[PDB]
Amino acid sequence: IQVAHSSRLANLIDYKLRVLTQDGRVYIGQLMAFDHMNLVLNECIEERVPKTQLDKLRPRGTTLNIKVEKRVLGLTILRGEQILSTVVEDKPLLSKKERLVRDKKEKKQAQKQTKLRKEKEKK
């Protein structure tokens, strides 16, 4: 996947990231919020290389095959102190045009509902 060169962590909202921790564990989930840079991941599944198969990654069949133990865990907030570096893996489900369309949709609906709320709460 290709990602725009001028794309901070704010542009990668609902991108499916690849967050790496200090202890060699990676997290693979959709980014949905941040802050100290402590993220919120939707369906991130944590992967790790067991100590029994770590020796196969050391320099020397021709192609390595590593069985990585993975755990399933949902809607988890990380802590920025442990985060080491983040990589991007996949694009969101929706295209850019459809994303803009739904943003305009929700903005119109919210403006109308706010106007009606003011009109009701005043009178």
Partner RNA sequence: ACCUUAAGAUAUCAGAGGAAAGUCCUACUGAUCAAACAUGCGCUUCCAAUAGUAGAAGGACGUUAAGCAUUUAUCAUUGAACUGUUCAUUGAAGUCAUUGAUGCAAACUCCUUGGUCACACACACAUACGGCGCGGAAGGCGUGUUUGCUGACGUUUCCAUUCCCUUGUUUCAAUCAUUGGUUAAACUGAUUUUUGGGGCCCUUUGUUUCUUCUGCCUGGAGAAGUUUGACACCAAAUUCAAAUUGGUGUUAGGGGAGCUGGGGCCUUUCAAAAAAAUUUUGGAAGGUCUUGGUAGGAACGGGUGGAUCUUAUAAUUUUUGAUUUAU
Tell me, residue by residue from 43 to 62, as one string, x for binding to RNA by CB under 7 A and - for no binding: --x----x-xx--x------
Query: In Å, what is the CA distance from 107 to each residue of 68, 100, 112, 115, 121?
Result: 43, 10, 9, 12, 21
Place of tokens 């290389």: 49
**Among 13, 33, 42, 70, which residue interacts with RNA (rule: CB under 7 A)?**
70
Whether 31 contacts 40, CB under 8 Å: yes
Residues lying near RNA in the complex (CB under 7 A) are found at 1-6, 10, 22-23, 36-38, 45, 50, 52-53, 56, 65, 67, 69-70, 72, 79-82, 91, 95-97, 100, 105, 108-109, 111-112, 114-116, 118-119
